[PDB]
Design a protein around this ligand. Structure first.
Ligand code: B2K
Length: 210
């Protein structure tokens, strides 16, 4: 039961720019995803103040970074608010439209790709290092879904029958062949310390079994 959707033309152009532009400072993708995780965790924490049952799906508010050399994936997991099917398919891409236009304008005026987060479209920076991105998400008001895209103007959404998450979002980065440094413990620690040292949630960098 896999549905295929076209990105809005502005998002497809943003993704092509990220993939095509020569830009060496790719490490910023991690700061952007951790920032998105922190925002989602802030959202559930805020909502839980007026409705404590919103934490019945899990009280722990944290971020896990999980590298896997065998699958060549780097996963960023949070126990934030999560996304409904409507968030995944339409609402978040609608918001992203204006941010995309402002960003592309800022770039033509002298800005650089690392400033993507100032335009609210930081998730797409995942395409600096990933040939494919899989997003597993679970919001309190909906079922678990798997979103996926290798760019090229489309994405898919399916209900996810994999390991249940409770609540939150898991961004799985299927890394490009030449971007395996992002699976290295020393490299991830360096990036987190440089760009994400003040995030208000524990960040656990998992290590590899082999
Ligand atoms: C496919 C997709 C849509 C939106 C996002 S996001 O950056 O807006 C976001 C939203 C939430 C609730 N959590 C996280 N981590 N990230 C990420 C990936």
């Amino acid at each position: 039961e896999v549905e295929t959707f076209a990105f809005q033309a502005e998002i497809a152009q943003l993704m092509s720019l990220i993939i095509n532009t020569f830009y060496s400072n790719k490490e910023i993708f991690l700061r952007e995803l951790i920032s998105n995780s922190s925002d989602a965790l802030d959202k559930i924490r805020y909502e839980s103040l007026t409705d404590p049952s919103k934490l019945d799906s899990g009280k722990e508010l944290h971020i896990n970074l999980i590298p896997n050399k065998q699958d060549r994936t780097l996963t960023i997991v949070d126990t934030g608010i999560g996304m409904t099917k409507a968030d995944l398919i339409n609402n978040l891409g609608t918001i992203a439209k204006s941010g995309t236009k402002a960003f592309m304008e800022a770039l033509q005026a002298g800005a650089d790709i690392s400033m993507i987060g100032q335009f609210g479209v930081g998730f797409y920076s995942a395409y600096l290092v990933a040939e494919k991105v899989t997003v597993i998400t679970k919001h309190n008001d909906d079922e678990q879904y798997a979103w996926e895209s290798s760019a090229g103007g489309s994405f898919t959404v399916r209900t996810d029958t994999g390991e249940p998450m409770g609540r939150g979002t898991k961004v799985i980065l299927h890394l490009k062949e030449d971007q395996t440094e992002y699976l290295e413990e020393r490299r991830i620690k360096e990036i987190v310390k440089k760009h994400s040292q003040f995030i208000g949630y524990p960040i656990t960098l998992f290590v590899e079994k082999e």
